[PDB]
Design a protein around this motif. Structure first.
Motif, PDB file in Angstrom:
ATOM      1  N   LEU A  51      -9.633  61.731  83.178  1.00 61.13           N
ATOM      2  CA  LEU A  51      -8.561  60.864  82.293  1.00 61.13           C
ATOM      3  C   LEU A  51      -7.814  60.591  82.453  1.00 61.13           C
ATOM      4  CD1 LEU A  51     -10.708  62.931  79.494  1.00 61.13           C
ATOM      5  CD2 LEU A  51     -11.792  61.604  80.798  1.00 61.13           C
ATOM      6  N   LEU A  52      -7.481  59.305  82.680  1.00 57.71           N
ATOM      7  CA  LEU A  52      -5.870  58.657  82.071  1.00 57.71           C
ATOM      8  C   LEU A  52      -5.507  58.433  81.000  1.00 57.71           C
ATOM      9  CD1 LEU A  52      -3.887  57.562  83.004  1.00 57.71           C
ATOM     10  CD2 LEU A  52      -4.942  55.361  83.533  1.00 57.71           C
ATOM     11  N   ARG A  53      -5.024  58.727  80.400  1.00 57.42           N
ATOM     12  CA  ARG A  53      -4.326  59.345  79.159  1.00 57.42           C
ATOM     13  C   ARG A  53      -3.661  58.034  78.414  1.00 57.42           C
ATOM     14  NH1 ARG A  53      -4.019  64.227  74.188  1.00 57.42           N
ATOM     15  NH2 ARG A  53      -3.743  62.754  72.238  1.00 57.42           N
ATOM     16  N   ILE A  54      -3.532  57.553  77.972  1.00 58.08           N
ATOM     17  CA  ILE A  54      -2.730  55.939  77.324  1.00 58.08           C
ATOM     18  C   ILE A  54      -2.164  56.358  75.595  1.00 58.08           C
ATOM     19  CG2 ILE A  54      -2.978  53.808  76.463  1.00 58.08           C
ATOM     20  CD1 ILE A  54      -5.055  53.074  78.843  1.00 58.08           C
ATOM     21  N   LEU A  55      -0.683  56.625  76.123  1.00 53.03           N
ATOM     22  CA  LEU A  55      -0.260  56.901  74.359  1.00 53.03           C
ATOM     23  C   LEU A  55       0.846  56.006  74.118  1.00 53.03           C
ATOM     24  CD1 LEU A  55       1.659  60.102  76.511  1.00 53.03           C
ATOM     25  CD2 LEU A  55      -1.209  59.957  75.879  1.00 53.03           C
ATOM     26  N   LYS A  56       0.745  56.147  72.716  1.00 56.69           N
ATOM     27  CA  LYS A  56       1.327  54.755  71.886  1.00 56.69           C
ATOM     28  C   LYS A  56       2.838  54.958  71.894  1.00 56.69           C
ATOM     29  CE  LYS A  56      -2.430  54.475  67.902  1.00 56.69           C
ATOM     30  NZ  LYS A  56      -2.455  54.527  67.013  1.00 56.69           N
ATOM     31  N   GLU A  57       3.402  53.662  72.208  1.00 57.30           N
ATOM     32  CA  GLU A  57       5.364  54.158  71.856  1.00 57.30           C
ATOM     33  C   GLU A  57       5.841  54.679  71.355  1.00 57.30           C
ATOM     34  OE1 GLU A  57       7.667  50.536  72.258  1.00 57.30           O
ATOM     35  OE2 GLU A  57       9.114  50.929  73.905  1.00 57.30           O
ATOM     36  N   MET A  78      -1.528  62.291  89.856  1.00 61.26           N
ATOM     37  CA  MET A  78      -1.357  62.480  89.117  1.00 61.26           C
ATOM     38  C   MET A  78      -2.035  62.918  87.668  1.00 61.26           C
ATOM     39  SD  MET A  78       3.234  62.056  88.996  1.00 61.26           S
ATOM     40  CE  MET A  78       2.950  64.421  88.201  1.00 61.26           C
ATOM     41  N   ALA A  79      -3.087  62.683  88.028  1.00 59.81           N
ATOM     42  CA  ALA A  79      -3.812  62.322  86.452  1.00 59.81           C
ATOM     43  C   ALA A  79      -5.187  63.213  87.316  1.00 59.81           C
ATOM     44  CB  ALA A  79      -4.442  60.996  86.172  1.00 59.81           C
ATOM     45  N   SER A  80      -5.340  62.560  88.266  1.00 58.18           N
ATOM     46  CA  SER A  80      -6.562  63.851  89.387  1.00 58.18           C
ATOM     47  C   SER A  80      -5.908  65.146  89.125  1.00 58.18           C
ATOM     48  CB  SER A  80      -6.622  63.373  90.589  1.00 58.18           C
ATOM     49  OG  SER A  80      -6.965  60.963  90.197  1.00 58.18           O
ATOM     50  N   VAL A  81      -5.134  65.087  89.320  1.00 53.64           N
ATOM     51  CA  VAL A  81      -4.528  66.954  89.652  1.00 53.64           C
ATOM     52  C   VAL A  81      -4.538  67.746  88.451  1.00 53.64           C
ATOM     53  CG1 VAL A  81      -4.025  66.599  92.446  1.00 53.64           C
ATOM     54  CG2 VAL A  81      -2.439  66.259  90.085  1.00 53.64           C
ATOM     55  N   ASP A  82      -4.967  69.066  88.865  1.00 52.11           N
ATOM     56  CA  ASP A  82      -4.998  70.453  87.487  1.00 52.11           C
ATOM     57  C   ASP A  82      -5.035  71.336  88.683  1.00 52.11           C
ATOM     58  OD1 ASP A  82      -4.670  71.792  85.610  1.00 52.11           O
ATOM     59  OD2 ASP A  82      -7.101  71.820  84.876  1.00 52.11           O
ATOM     60  N   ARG A 142       1.424  67.754  86.650  1.00 54.22           N
ATOM     61  CA  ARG A 142       1.111  66.983  85.142  1.00 54.22           C
ATOM     62  C   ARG A 142       1.331  66.097  84.993  1.00 54.22           C
ATOM     63  NH1 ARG A 142      -3.367  70.030  81.530  1.00 54.22           N
ATOM     64  NH2 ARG A 142      -2.394  72.193  82.328  1.00 54.22           N
ATOM     65  N   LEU A 143       0.127  64.613  84.636  1.00 56.70           N
ATOM     66  CA  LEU A 143       0.454  63.359  84.300  1.00 56.70           C
ATOM     67  C   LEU A 143       0.008  63.695  82.597  1.00 56.70           C
ATOM     68  CD1 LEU A 143       1.872  60.739  83.940  1.00 56.70           C
ATOM     69  CD2 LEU A 143      -0.618  59.878  85.000  1.00 56.70           C
ATOM     70  N   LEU A 144       0.719  63.379  81.486  1.00 58.95           N
ATOM     71  CA  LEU A 144       0.235  64.057  80.597  1.00 58.95           C
ATOM     72  C   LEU A 144      -0.778  62.162  79.989  1.00 58.95           C
ATOM     73  CD1 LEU A 144       2.529  66.173  77.892  1.00 58.95           C
ATOM     74  CD2 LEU A 144       1.510  66.889  80.204  1.00 58.95           C
ATOM     75  N   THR A 152       5.684  67.582  93.356  1.00 60.86           N
ATOM     76  CA  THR A 152       5.871  66.112  92.449  1.00 60.86           C
ATOM     77  C   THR A 152       5.816  65.095  93.912  1.00 60.86           C
ATOM     78  OG1 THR A 152       6.298  64.868  90.738  1.00 60.86           O
ATOM     79  CG2 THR A 152       8.142  66.088  92.094  1.00 60.86           C
ATOM     80  N   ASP A 153       5.897  63.719  93.288  1.00 61.11           N
ATOM     81  CA  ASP A 153       5.963  62.804  94.086  1.00 61.11           C
ATOM     82  C   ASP A 153       5.180  62.770  94.483  1.00 61.11           C
ATOM     83  OD1 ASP A 153       7.312  60.469  95.492  1.00 61.11           O
ATOM     84  OD2 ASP A 153       9.404  61.417  95.404  1.00 61.11           O
ATOM     85  N   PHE A 154       3.849  62.112  94.326  1.00 54.16           N
ATOM     86  CA  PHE A 154       2.933  61.343  94.496  1.00 54.16           C
ATOM     87  C   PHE A 154       2.960  60.005  94.768  1.00 54.16           C
ATOM     88  CE2 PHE A 154       2.505  64.929  92.331  1.00 54.16           C
ATOM     89  CZ  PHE A 154       1.713  65.953  93.720  1.00 54.16           C
TER      90      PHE A 154
END
Ligand SMILES: CC(C)(O)Cn1c(NC(=O)c2cc(F)cc(-c3cccnc3)c2)nc2ccccc21
Length: 291
Positions: free
Chosen positions: A7-13, A67-71, A77-79, A155-157
């Motif tokens: 899941l790629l979550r889209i966050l509000k500003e 980053m979204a694809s890794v746990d 972690r990408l939030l 980090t850094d992908f």
């Protein structure tokens, strides 16, 4: 290949609040910040990473993809991402910064227990990327971050791939022929270790990068750091073999470093060790892993 159900979550500003700038310039603008999901009494500390060009937006999103694809505990972690004019990567905050800066700032307070623990955690982290079939292509102390002194993550992908460049961390086959495998990341793991064991020295310092390819061809390698025993240095040298298949896999490095981490003062000799604090050939099952 297997389907990627991340899941790629889209966050509000509006959901998050920038507090101060941590890093800046070329790679981006990293901000300290707090994120508060819309309908939850929860404040999550975060690092936000932001001119808008089409080429720049491709690469920042490709980082976000991975980053979204890794746990994993030892991988960042990408939030989410926020789609403002300039795209923002909302990531987990790493309060103590990169490990390279951490070791240099705390040369006189880092014990052998911590050093070898970081070696295990990094090796663990990389082994997960090997399991996920990802080659990192830019492993170094600058791209390992410190959540706590007891917990580090890779980090850094932006340079990561499936199956300006840092010549001084790259394997020979990568420098000559642009061939990157997981074992070419082991070379870089070796250098990263050497950075930590030298408390953040520059590898091949006062040597220009064009000379490196021929230097390594002649047989020369980075020297043995003063604190390192022959046991630990041997493991580094094994990562820097010309034959890639001769180098160790990350699963084996995890074993050897965890072995050493049980009796740290045998494998590393630091001045005044284990009088310093921060803010039987046996391996515990959790450090024994099959691919
Ligand atoms: C330059 C650097 C790393 O020290 C900035 N910094 C950070 N960095 C992060 O929080 C952070 C977290 C991530 F999940 C990814 C990246 C990240 C890093 C490179 C590329 N892409 C993504 C950076 N925390 C700090 C605390 C104190 C001082 C500086 C700090």
């Amino acid at each position: 290949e297997a389907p990627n159900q991340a899941l790629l979550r889209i966050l509000k500003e509006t959901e998050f609040k920038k507090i101060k700038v941590l890093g800046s310039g070329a790679f981006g603008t990293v901000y300290k910040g707090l994120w508060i999901p819309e309908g939850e009494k929860v404040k999550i500390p975060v690092a936000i990473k932001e001119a808008t060009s089409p080429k720049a937006n491709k690469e920042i999103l490709d980082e976000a993809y991975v980053m979204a694809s890794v746990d994993n505990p030892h991988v960042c972690r990408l939030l989410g991402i926020c789609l403002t004019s300039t795209v923002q990567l909302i990531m987990q905050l790493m309060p103590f910064g990169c490990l390279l800066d951490y070791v240099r700032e705390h040369k006189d307070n880092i014990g052998s227990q911590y050093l070898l623990n970081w070696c295990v955690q990094i090796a663990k982290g990389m082994n997960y990327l090997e399991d996920r079939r990802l080659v990192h292509r830019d492993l170094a102390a600058r791209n390992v971050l410190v959540k706590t002194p007891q917990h580090v993550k890779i980090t850094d992908f932006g340079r990561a791939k499936l199956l300006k460049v840092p010549i001084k961390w790259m394997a020979l086959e990568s420098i000559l022929h642009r061939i990157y495998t997981h074992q070419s990341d082991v070379w870089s793991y070796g250098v990263t270790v050497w950075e930590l064991m030298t408390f953040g020295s520059k590898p091949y310092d006062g040597i220009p990068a064009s000379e490196i390819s021929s230097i390594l061809e002649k047989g020369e390698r980075l020297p043995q750091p003063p604190i390192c025993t022959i046991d630990v240095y041997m493991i580094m040298v094994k990562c820097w073999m010309i034959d890639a298949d001769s180098r160790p896999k990350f699963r084996e490095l995890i074993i050897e470093f965890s072995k050493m981490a049980r009796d740290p003062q045998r494998y590393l000799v630091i001045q005044g060790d284990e009088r310093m604090h921060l803010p039987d050939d046996v391996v515990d099952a959790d450090e024994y892993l099959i691919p």
